[PDB]
Design an enzyme around this catalytic site. Structure first.
Site, short mmCIF file in Angstrom:
data_model
loop_
_atom_site.label_atom_id
_atom_site.label_comp_id
_atom_site.label_asym_id
_atom_site.label_seq_id
_atom_site.Cartn_x
_atom_site.Cartn_y
_atom_site.Cartn_z
CG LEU E 39 -1.98 -1.11 1.27
CD1 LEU E 39 -3.01 -0.86 2.35
CD2 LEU E 39 -2.65 -1.28 -0.08
CG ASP E 40 0.19 3.85 -2.52
OD1 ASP E 40 -0.95 3.89 -3.03
OD2 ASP E 40 1.14 3.22 -3.02
#
Ligand SMILES: CCCCCCCCCCCCCCCCCC(=O)OC[C@H](COP(=O)([O-])OCC[N+](C)(C)C)OC(=O)CCCCCCCCCCCCCCCCC
Ligand SMILES: CCCCCCCCCCC[C@H](O)CC(=O)SCCNC(=O)CCNC(=O)[C@H](O)C(C)(C)COP(=O)(O)O
Ligand code: SF4
Ligand code: SF4
Ligand code: SF4
Lengths: 115, 115, 176, 155, 85
Positions: E39-40
């Protein structure tokens, strides 16, 4: 001089903190924008548009450029919240009328001289 | 009863004028045509705009004044009594009390459209 | 030097106070306003019966453009492009070339009348009185396209209005 | 035949519609003052039945008198949509016609006809009040020659 | 009664597997959002919202960035609401 003065952030982490706050505000605003402007799009579509607008500037490394981007983003958010923008302004992020431009070499070669 | 016929005729002709007025024109309606008028933009519903205690207070003070006026209406027949001094005393009494209500509202802010 | 516009104090004696009380209770200045409107009702209106009567103009009036000729019928425009250079709105488009007889004449002369600001700079710049603004002001159109004038359109305007255009020029050229 | 009655009814309705052309005051720029000069006593647009009207709900013609900017165009289209029909648009002045002095600007729409359909284009910068009055009478003559009921009778 | 530790863990689990980019099978108690689930930090910012609308209170930026593993959100929620099982 060798160094420069900041806008707000003295570092990249501060710029990231303000970016995250602005992203939070925009993400929460999107449903109210969809309801209030009576947009024919979904909240997922609007939040994905917000993310894609944020992702355009992900390559920025200068904290002052990041700060000015945050300033302009907050300005846009305040135009959206206070309903200073019309529906046409909100819908301009989605270029629904513009035709899909070519991207590969061959189609661009077919349609004209532009690189 | 003549008056009933007159009322029936007036109401009937007004409703007939509605029917011609509201059915005779040729129509072509879309969504943005019938949108509420706000000088070139969209109106905000907000939440129960018609407020402020002053609009209600003028209504209440009109109500009480109207009640005293109801008490004053029998006056043209009241002057036909042999006991004119009592009737004059009571009519002037009612009018002093009207003036006293006006003065009390006046002095205790009352009739003012404050900040 | 200066003057005060609202630096008068009202007099506070019996007669003046009674004057102001009568003005308050009997609405005398409101009656003066009613009198002024009543006096205007009995004045001849300034309305003119258009289009049977027309508003007065002057020979300098700047209306619809026209291209003019010499008495010989030869065009005056020698395609110097001074009007196109000076045009504040860039409303003038010109193309030229040697004519078959060798004359220096335009092959394109367009005026976007919806770009035009009707300033008259073109007729000032013109060294031969070729382009002018004529007296016509009633040339409204039902479409946008009829206001994008051609060389043929402007020459027909010149032939149409030259009789009064020349009289206006004779009236005003000594001021120019 | 029955086309004579339809023609007479069309003539009546089109006489009533051009004898009460109630316009909407869309004064954007310098062209607004020449239009209130056509309003002034010298020309007296009210003598033609052309009243000083109000909210678009009682307006029959839109007069675009002045420069339309990009910031302003959505409002102009909104009020155009809110006009009841039949409705007409008169473009007055170079700015409203095709952009005018500001044709090559970043913030000016080049002609209101990109936003609304326009019936009459009144040229000038500004058109004189007499020129605007000529445009109004020309619009009246446009209404006189409509054949809405005769179109319907041959459908 | 004050919701216990597992009463926080299951809520975190549900709202985490509602998230599209988070696979339920790849989601564990200590599945760090960035390196494990891919994920970011914008994705983490998005899930932190989903931890705000459920648990009621507001998680501020100063410490909301510190919430990486799904266990860390659980511990933060337990600390904030005076929860001690
Ligand atoms: C005070 C007033 C008291 C009452 C006064 C009544 C006056 C009656 C005289 C005629 C009134 C107008 C009738 C026509 C309506 C307007 C019009 O032009 O409609 C065109 C329209 C045109 O229809 P169309 O089908 O050609 O076009 C409609 C569809 N679009 C717009 C997409 C093209 O006519 C009709 O719809 C049919 C009209 C039938 C005939 C009506 C006769 C008069 C009836 C009342 C008497
Ligand atoms: C309703 C419909 C929609 C209507 C509304 C549509 C538009 C809504 C948004 C309008 C504003 C627009 O996004 C521009 C702004 O705010 S820009 C802020 C700076 N942006 C950066 O990118 C800085 C540098 N970037 C990084 O440092 C990282 O790459 C990043 C932070 C991205 C991820 O960090 P993570 O730790 O990996
Ligand atoms: S009148 Fe002015 S704007 Fe119009 S064509 Fe001549 S120079 Fe250009
Ligand atoms: S109209 Fe006059 S100024 Fe314009 S190109 Fe011709 S000669 Fe030159
Ligand atoms: S056409 Fe000329 S007068 Fe009219 S608004 Fe534009 S600049 Fe002003």
């Amino acid at each position: 001089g060798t160094s420069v003065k900041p806008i707000f952030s003295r570092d990249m982490n501060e710029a990231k903190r303000r970016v995250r706050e602005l992203y939070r505000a925009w993400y929460r605003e999107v449903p109210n924008t969809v309801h209030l402007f009576q947009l024919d799009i979904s909240v997922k579509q609007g939040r994905d548009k917000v993310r894609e607008m944020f992702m355009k500037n992900a390559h920025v490394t200068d904290p002052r450029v990041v700060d000015l981007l945050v300033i302009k983003g907050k300005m846009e958010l305040e135009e959206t919240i206070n309903v200073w923008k019309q529906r046409t302004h909100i819908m301009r992020f989605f270029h629904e009328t513009e035709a899909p431009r070519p991207t590969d070499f061959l189609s661009k070669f077919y349609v004209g001289h532009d690189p | 009863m003549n008056i009933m016929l007159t009322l029936l005729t007036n109401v009937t002709l007004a409703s007939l004028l509605v029917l011609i007025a509201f059915w005779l024109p040729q129509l072509n309606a879309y969504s943005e045509k019938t949108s509420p008028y706000e000088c070139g933009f969209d109106p905000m519903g907000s939440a129960r705009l018609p407020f402020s205690m002053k609009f209600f207070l003028v209504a209440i003070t009109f109500l009480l004044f109207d009640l005293e006026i109801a008490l004053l209406l029998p006056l043209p027949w009241a002057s036909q009594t042999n006991n004119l001094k009592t009737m004059l005393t009571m009519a002037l009494f009612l009018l002093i009390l009207l003036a006293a209500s006006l003065a009390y509202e006046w002095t205790q802010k009352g009739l003012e459209w404050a900040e | 030097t200066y003057k005060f516009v609202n630096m008068r104090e009202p007099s506070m004696d019996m007669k003046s106070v009674t004057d102001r009380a009568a003005q308050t209770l009997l609405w005398t200045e409101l009656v003066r306003g009613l009198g002024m409107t009543l006096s205007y009702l009995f004045r001849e209106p300034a309305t003119i019966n258009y289009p049977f009567e027309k508003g007065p103009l002057s020979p300098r009036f700047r209306g619809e453009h026209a291209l003019r000729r010499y008495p010989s019928g030869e065009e005056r425009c020698i395609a110097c492009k001074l009007c196109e250079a000076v045009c504040p709105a860039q409303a003038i488009t010109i193309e030229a070339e040697p004519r078959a007889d060798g004359s220096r004449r335009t092959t394109r002369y367009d005026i976007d009348m919806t770009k035009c600001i009707y300033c008259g700079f073109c007729q000032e710049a013109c060294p031969v009185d070729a382009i002018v603004e004529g007296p016509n002001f009633e040339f409204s159109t039902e479409t946008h396209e009829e206001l994008l004038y051609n060389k043929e359109k402007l020459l027909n305007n010149g032939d149409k209005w030259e009789a009064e255009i020349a009289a206006n020029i004779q009236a005003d050229y000594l001021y120019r | 035949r029955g086309e004579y009655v339809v023609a007479k009814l069309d003539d009546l309705v089109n006489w009533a519609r051009r004898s009460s052309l109630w316009p909407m005051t869309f004064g954007l720029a310098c062209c607004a003052v020449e239009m209130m000069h056509m309003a002034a006593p010298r020309y007296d647009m009210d003598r033609f039945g052309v009243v000083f009207r109000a909210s678009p709900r009682q307006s029959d013609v839109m007069i675009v008198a002045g420069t339309l900017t990009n910031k302003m165009a959505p409002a102009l289209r909104k009020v155009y949509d809110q006009m009841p029909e039949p409705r007409y648009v008169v473009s007055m002045g170079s700015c409203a016609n095709g952009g005018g002095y500001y044709h090559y600007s970043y913030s000016v729409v080049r002609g209101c006809d990109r936003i609304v359909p326009v019936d009459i284009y009144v040229p000038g910068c500004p058109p004189t009040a007499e020129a605007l009055l000529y445009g109004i009478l020309q619009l009246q003559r446009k209404i006189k020659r409509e054949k809405r009921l005769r179109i319907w009778y041959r459908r | 009664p004050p919701l216990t530790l597992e009463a926080i863990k299951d809520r975190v689990l549900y709202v985490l597997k509602l998230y599209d980019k988070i696979d339920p099978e790849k989601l564990s108690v200590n599945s760090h959002f960035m390196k494990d689930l891919g994920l970011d930090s914008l994705d983490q910012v998005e899930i932190i919202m989903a931890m705000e609308d459920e648990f009621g209170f507001e998680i501020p930026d100063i410490d909301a960035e510190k919430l990486m593993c799904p266990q860390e959100i659980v511990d933060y929620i337990a600390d904030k609401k005076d929860v001690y099982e």
